[PDB]
Amino acid sequence: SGWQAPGPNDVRAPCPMLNTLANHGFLPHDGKGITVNKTIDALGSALNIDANLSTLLFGFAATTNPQPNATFFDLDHLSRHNILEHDASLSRQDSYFGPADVFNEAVFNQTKSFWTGDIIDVQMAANARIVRLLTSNLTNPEYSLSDLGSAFSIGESAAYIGILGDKKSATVPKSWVEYLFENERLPYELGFKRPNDPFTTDDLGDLSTQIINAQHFPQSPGKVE
């Protein structure tokens, strides 16, 4: 009741949240044929994402469809390397090593080790992302991070805090974030509840700026902001 794993003809993304929303049936369970209206309704219904932010994200998503000027995308279109998908993901390996769409325990064990308390704050989120960037640069001879990929990286850490947790305190319970990643299911039973206030483009930008301000390199090595 309310959740089904994907089956052999379903497609999934490198996005733990869209995967979770397909598993629940907010998005089509097969991951296919997602339009702007399905995106607005799904992200609104499940998470209280506002329409303008949903439309922005949809605009990016549609660029991954191999069909030009497409009005839909499928979740596996999002896995195409270096369109939106990028190196130094928190829970996916880099494309160079292996498929960059599915959960990777080794990678997620690294991320988790930088979430040092029961409550994730901006500092811990920023620190986990940093070590992923540096690790990929020092281990992946094809490491790359485009301007768009860097903006995505920073906004994905902002998103788990502000969409799953409390955008005002900029904190989220660690257990909730680990449950989302490890299960691709919303952690309702751990306490998650859809927020009453919409999550906006400005909310995402505000948390993204917080993430960057929590970075304290003596000297920045490559693309970090």
3-state SS of the chain? CCCCCCCCCCCCCCCHHHHHHHHHCCCCCCCCCECHHHHHHHHHHHHCECHHHHHHHHHHHHCCCCCCCCCCECHHHHHCECCCECCCCCCCCCCCCCCCCCCCHHHHHHHHHCCCCCEEEHHHHHHHHHHHHHHHHHHCCCCCCCHHHHHHHHHHHHHHHHHHCECCCCEEEHHHHHHHHHHCCCCHHHCCCCCCCCECHHHHHHHHHHHHHCCCCCCCCCCCC
Could you give the CA distance from residue 20 to residue 183 in angstroms, rounded to a whole number?
8
Contact 133, 153 (CB under 8 A): yes
- 170 forms part of the interface with ligand HEM (CB under 6 A): no
Closest-approach residue to ligand PIW (CB): 155
Residue among 2, 106, 189, 193 that touches ligand NAG (CB under 6 A): 106
By rule CB under 6 A, what count of residues binds ligand NAG?
10
- 156 forms part of the interface with ligand PIW (CB under 6 A): yes
- 134 forms part of the interface with ligand PIW (CB under 6 A): no
Residue among 11, 12, 15, 133 that touches ligand HEM (CB under 6 A): 15
CB of 181 to ligand HEM, least distance (A): 7
**Which residues in the 126-185 window bind ligand NAG by CB under 6 A?**
137, 143-145
Nearer to Mg ion, 111 or 171 (CB): 111
**Which residues in the 83-142 window bind ligand HEM by CB under 6 A?**
84-86, 89-92
Contact 122, 161 (CB under 8 A): yes
By rule CB under 6 A, what count of residues binds ligand HEM?
27
- Annotated ligand binding at 208? The verdict is no
Question: Could you list the residues that contact ligand PIW (CB under 6 A)?
Answer: 15, 57, 60, 151-152, 155-156, 159
Question: Could you list the residues that contact Mg ion (CB under 5 A)?
Answer: 85-86, 89, 92, 100
Binding residues for Mg(2+): 85-86, 89
Question: Could you list the residues that contact ligand HEM (CB under 6 A)?
Answer: 14-18, 39, 43, 47, 49, 57-58, 60-61, 78, 84-86, 89-92, 152, 156, 159-160, 163-164
